[PDB]
Amino acid sequence: GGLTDEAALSCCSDADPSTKDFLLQQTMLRVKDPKKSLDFYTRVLGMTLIQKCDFPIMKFSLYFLAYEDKNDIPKEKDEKIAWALSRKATLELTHNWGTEDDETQSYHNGNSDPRGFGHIGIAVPDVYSACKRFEELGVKFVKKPDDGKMKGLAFIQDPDGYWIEILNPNKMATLM
């Protein structure tokens, strides 16, 4: 079986005071073609590009996306970086230059061997209307809301095949 509630709680320690201002800032995914990824995360999911970083010597670019208002992005370069990297829950897309033209390359989504990472998840007001719009836009589904084992939640895929869960927090209580 799994851990009992009691055993799980027994493995948890209270937070040391030196970790009090820590925050979960980002999740990083590698993307083959940033033009496709930027269109997907902004047009389909409504995220905002808050910061683009280029490192010519190492041949890669980074794209930070988040659910933030465009009007809150600072104009000054140094303030912009400090603000972008101190937002909670950002998505960092890494583009290693050249992958978009290489037919033998692709990234692995973690859901087939060898497994590891599973998904990112977006909380929405209504899974059914959000998925109706996704179907209208031609988005590829891993799991429609009424398919699979757990009903009421969905999995879509981004341009690289990463899985994105679509969930409504106020309808999850009957799954357990």
Ligand X SMILES: N[C@@H](CCC(=O)N[C@@H](CS[C@@H](O)N(O)c1ccc(I)cc1)C(=O)NCC(=O)O)C(=O)O
Q: Which of residues 39-78 bind ligand X (CB under 6 A)?
A: 53, 58, 60, 62
Q: Which member of 75, 101, 103, 149 binds its own copies (CB under 8 A)?
A: 149
Check 79, 103, 136, 165 and give the catalytic one: 165
Give whichever of 71 and 170 is closer to ligand X, judged by the CB atom: 170
Residues 3-42 that bind Zn ion (CB under 5 A): 28
- Per the DSSP assignment, residues forming a β-bridge with 49 are 65
Active site residue 79: no
Residues 117-146 as x/- pattern, contact with ligand X by CB under 6 A:
-x--x---------------------x---
CB of 40 to its own copies, least distance (A): 10
CA 68 to CA 98: how far, in whole Å? Answer: 30
CA 125 to CA 154: how far, in whole Å? Answer: 13
Is 88 annotated in some ligand binding site? no
Is 95 annotated in some ligand binding site? no
Contact 65, 50 (CB under 8 A): yes
CA 171 to CA 169: how far, in whole Å? Answer: 6
Dihedral of alpha carbons 156, 103, 60, 52, sign? negative
Residues 31-90 that bind Zn ion (CB under 5 A): none
Residues 6+ apart with CB under 8 A from 3: 11
Give whichever of 15 and 173 is closer to Zn ion, judged by the CB atom: 173
Nearest to 122 by CA among 161, 66, 71, 59: 66
Q: Which member of 118, 135, 140, 147 binds its own copies (CB under 8 A)?
A: 118
What are φ and ψ of residue 142, in 5° steps? -90, -40
Instruction: Please choose which of Zn ion, its own copies, ligand X, none residue 142 contacts, taking the beta carbon within 5 to 8 angstroms, the exact cut-off set by kind.
Output: none
44: DSSP letter: I
Q: Which member of 94, 107, 122, 168 binds ligand X (CB under 6 A)?
A: 94
What are φ and ψ of residue 90, in 5° steps? -100, 160
Positions at the binding site for substrate: 26, 30, 96, 115, 119, 149-150
Give me the active site residues, please: 165
